[PDB]
Amino acid sequence: CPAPELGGPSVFLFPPKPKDTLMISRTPEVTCVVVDVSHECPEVKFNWYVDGVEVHNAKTKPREEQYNSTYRVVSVLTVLHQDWLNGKEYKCKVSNCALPAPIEKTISKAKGQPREPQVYTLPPSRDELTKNQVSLTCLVKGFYPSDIAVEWESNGQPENNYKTTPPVLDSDGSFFLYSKLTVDKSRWQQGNVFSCSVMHEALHNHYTQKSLSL
Amino acid sequence: PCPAPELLGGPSVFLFPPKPKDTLMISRTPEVTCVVVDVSHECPEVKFNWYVDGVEVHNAKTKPREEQYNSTYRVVSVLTVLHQDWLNGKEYKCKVSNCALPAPIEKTISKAKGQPREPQVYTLPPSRDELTKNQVSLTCLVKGFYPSDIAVEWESNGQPENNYKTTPPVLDSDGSFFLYSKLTVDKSRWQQGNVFSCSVMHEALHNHYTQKSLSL
Ligand SMILES: *[C@@H]1O[C@H](CO[C@@H]2O[C@@H](C)[C@@H](O)[C@@H](O)[C@@H]2O)[C@@H](O[C@@H]2O[C@H](CO)[C@@H](O[C@@H]3O[C@H](CO[C@H]4O[C@H](CO)[C@@H](O)[C@H](O)[C@@H]4O[C@@H]4O[C@H](CO)[C@@H](O[C@@H]5O[C@H](CO)[C@H](O)[C@H](O)[C@H]5O)[C@H](O)[C@H]4NC(C)=O)[C@@H](O)[C@H](O[C@H]4O[C@H](CO)[C@@H](O)[C@H](O)[C@@H]4O[C@@H]4O[C@H](CO)[C@@H](O)[C@H](O)[C@H]4NC(C)=O)[C@@H]3O)[C@H](O)[C@H]2NC(C)=O)[C@H](O)[C@H]1NC(C)=O
Ligand SMILES: *[C@@H]1O[C@H](CO[C@@H]2O[C@@H](C)[C@@H](O)[C@@H](O)[C@@H]2O)[C@@H](O[C@@H]2O[C@H](CO)[C@@H](O[C@@H]3O[C@H](CO[C@H]4O[C@H](CO)[C@@H](O)[C@H](O)[C@@H]4O[C@@H]4O[C@H](CO)[C@@H](O[C@@H]5O[C@H](CO)[C@H](O)[C@H](O)[C@H]5O)[C@H](O)[C@H]4NC(C)=O)[C@@H](O)[C@H](O[C@H]4O[C@H](CO)[C@@H](O)[C@H](O)[C@@H]4O[C@@H]4O[C@H](CO)[C@@H](O)[C@H](O)[C@H]4NC(C)=O)[C@@H]3O)[C@H](O)[C@H]2NC(C)=O)[C@H](O)[C@H]1NC(C)=O
């Protein structure tokens, strides 16, 4: 597919996954994505800075050919958990020949007092017990920033059949969301215990669990 | 299919659907709004053609171009649509012509395709643990609806209760959508026993409207 352009290409910069910054064990990554990379000029150069200090541990993924006859070059910067949580600024400077001037883009965590999420499990409506599957609701509210991970389990095994809304801005400038775990109605009435797990900066050990059962 | 060639020196087109509530209530007026921005001073003249299922229509209302502070014009055309045409999945095409374009820009919009699915509406009282706080969360779960166009509201004694927030529709595993709406009320107003109603407006409901009540 022919679709050339000229500045040159666009840069997009993405933060780490909430979960990855909140557990020491995980590897949080800031990601600099370059699109609209031409063929006459498909080599890409990356500079990375942490609070204006250059760092060199960036890894560049191999080019991936796009439907519209452009290239997509991605550079991945592993970050220190506490750096990201302490609000350090990450700069991705992109040099390509189609750019007279380097493109600089900067991201950091949302600013301001972290706020503890309140976690409340809600059993199915009596009206839903007619169906063969029921809705186990986890309300998470009062949290800031919006960065959060929600998970579900029973007998310390991950429940797979859940969906979680994105965070929504509340009137107080806090965030809330809802996570819906869908189970066979029998499992509910049989009285199996279900856990809603929430990971967030403003929790002790960055973790809480509210249990739910008949 | 490959996309039509775009250019920066030329204008841009944005085409906006009716509001969900506007198509579901015969008393309201649903509209499709075609907005052209970045119209150059040197080519200010804008031509709109409108098509319903590729059949040109003539009843659209076009407003005088109005200058922005960045020294480009923004031009708007409004097509009133018949409620039953939108809900019967008709395709609304805006065609925009300008000397700064190699060819006219075409944009299309319609209700998302597929068999409508009735929303199930379930009210959930505040958690035991939330009763220690001064304000409590009245929860309205709406699941199994298609398409994602829906309106949700709250009320008590037939008076709108406005201290609520509603999640976007979320794609569910069965290809249907769900959302939650959170109404926030003083714990007092819940404990005295006042009655709160969660209202859902959707295509696949009888008369496009249901209500599920909630109280102590
Ligand atoms: C040529 O084609 C390519 C691609 O074509 C594609 O394939 C074909 C078949 C089609 O299907 C086509 O539609 C496809 O896209 C075109 O490339 C695109 O270029 C545009 C820019 O023009 C990019 O648009 C931006 O998208 C941003 C979000 O992108 C993510 O989400 C989408 C899904 O919706 C994905 O497609 C992307 O890949 C991104 O996905 C994310 O990628 C991250 C990096 O890996 C992931 O995070 C990482 O995840 C990994 C593992 O997954 C690790 O955990 C890492 O730790 C972690 O970092 C992330 O999970 C993943 N997320 C998701 C959601 O999946 C938008 O942010 C951005 O919006 C801004 O900019 C727009 C203007 O350009 C503007 O209109 C918007 O309003 C918004 O503007 C901003 O608004 C904010 C306020 O919110 C302001 O603060 C900002 O200042 C403001 N910015 C600006 C600039 O004004 C863009 O919309 C598009 O993503 C990109 N696609 C890809 C794949 O790269 C190319 O354009 C074509 N060329 C031409 C000329 O046509
Ligand atoms: C010069 O200025 C002009 C004008 O700006 C103004 O003046 C300047 C000086 C400033 O003061 C500025 O603050 C002023 O606003 C600039 O014009 C802008 O151009 C940009 C594009 O460059 C437009 O950006 C798009 O915005 C869309 C959202 O638009 C609405 O929402 C914003 C607020 O978020 C409003 O400000 C807009 O006015 C729009 O508002 C809507 O208006 C509708 C029409 O009236 C309303 O609907 C109707 O409402 C009535 C009642 O009111 C009835 O209900 C009718 O029934 C109903 O139809 C509606 O209420 C209202 N909405 C809201 C929420 O208020 C974005 O949608 C759009 O995004 C798409 O495209 C991007 C790429 O361009 C992409 O990144 C996005 O992801 C998204 O991509 C699309 O995704 C969709 C699905 O999501 C797909 O269909 C497509 O595949 C895909 N498209 C593409 C192209 O790939 C853009 O971000 C901006 O709207 C516009 N402003 C205005 C006011 O017109 C101009 O840029 C300046 N020029 C220069 C060079 O600087």
Give yes or no for residue A38 CB within 6 A of ligand 1. Answer: no
Choosing from A107, A126, A155, the residue where a domain stops is: A107
C-alpha neighbours within 13 Å on the C-beta side of residue B110: 16
DSSP H helical segments within A23-151, as ranges?
A: 81-85
Bridge partners for B101 per DSSP:
none
* Cβ atoms of residues A14 and A28 within 8 Å: no
CA of A12 relative to ligand 1 center, distance in Å: 7
Which token pair is B78? 């409004």
Nearest CA of chain B to the CA of A208: how many Å? 14
Q: Domain range for residue B65?
A: 12-109
Bridge partners for A183 per DSSP:
A134
Domain tally for chain A? Answer: 2
Choosing from B60, B90, B109, the residue where a domain stops is: B109
First to last CA, chain A: 57
Q: What sign has the CA pseudo-torsion B191, A177, B156, B122?
A: negative
**Whether residue A88 is found in the same domain as residue A136:** no
Give yes or no for residue B110 CB within 6 A of ligand 2. Answer: no
Nearest CA of chain A to the CA of B138: how many Å? 11
| Matching residue, tokens 């579900």 | A152
Residues in chain B: 216
Give yes or no for residue A36 CB within 6 A of ligand 1. Answer: yes
Q: A20 — phi, psi (to 5°)? A: -70, -30
User: What kind of experiment solved this structure?
Assistant: X-ray
**Whether residue A125 is found in the same domain as residue A95:** no
> Which residue among B127, B141, B172 places its CB closest to the CB of A121?
B127
Residue B82 placed within a domain: yes
Closest by CA to A90, choosing from A59, A58, A44, is: A58
Give contacts of B179 with chain A, Cβ < 8 Å: 165
| Matching residue, tokens 């009843």 | B59
The reply to whether residue B173 touches residue A165, judged by beta carbons under 8 angstroms, is no
Which token pair is A38? 């031409």
DSSP label of A167: P
Residues B161/B165/B169/B170 CA torsion (nearest 10 deg): -130
**Whether residue B160 is found in the same domain as residue B87:** no
**Whether residue A55 is found in the same domain as residue A127:** no
Between CA A131 and CA B173 the distance in angstroms is 16
Which token pair is B211? 């209500």
* Cβ atoms of residues A178 and A152 within 8 Å: no
* CATH number assigned to the domain comprising residue B193: 2.60.40.10
**Whether residue A137 is found in the same domain as residue A205:** yes
Between CA B131 and CA A159 the distance in angstroms is 28
**Resolution in angstroms for this experimental structure?**
2.2
Give yes or no for residue A146 CB within 6 A of ligand 1. Answer: no
Q: Which amino acid is at B182?
A: K
Q: B86 — phi, psi (to 5°)? A: -55, -50
Residue B2 placed within a domain: no
Residue B85 placed within a domain: yes
Q: What is the 3-state secondary structure (H, E, C) of chain B?
A: CCCCCCCCCCCEEEEECCCHHHHHCCCCCCEEEEEEEEECCCCCCCEEEEEECCEEECCCEECCCEECCCCCEEEEEEEECCHHHHHCCCCEEEEEECCCCCCCEEEEECCCCCCCECCEEEEECCCHHHHHCCEEEEEEEEEEEECCCCEEEEEECCEECCCEEECCCEECCCCCEEEEEEEEEEHHHHHCCCCEEEEEECCCCHHHCEEEEECC
**Whether residue B125 is found in the same domain as residue B209:** yes
Between CA B96 and CA B49 the distance in angstroms is 7
Residue A26 placed within a domain: yes
Nearest CA of chain A to the CA of B21: how many Å? 21
**Whether residue A85 is found in the same domain as residue A133:** no
| Matching residue, tokens 């015969």 | B26
Between CA B60 and CA B50 the distance in angstroms is 7
Residue B115 placed within a domain: no
Closest by CA to B63, choosing from B78, B49, B45, B44, is: B78
Widest distance between CA atoms in chain A: 67
Residue A130 placed within a domain: yes
Choosing from A78, A107, A136, the residue where a domain stops is: A107
For residue A95, the Cα-to-chain-centroid distance in whole angstroms is 27
Between CA B51 and CA B59 the distance in angstroms is 11
**Whether residue A123 is found in the same domain as residue A155:** yes
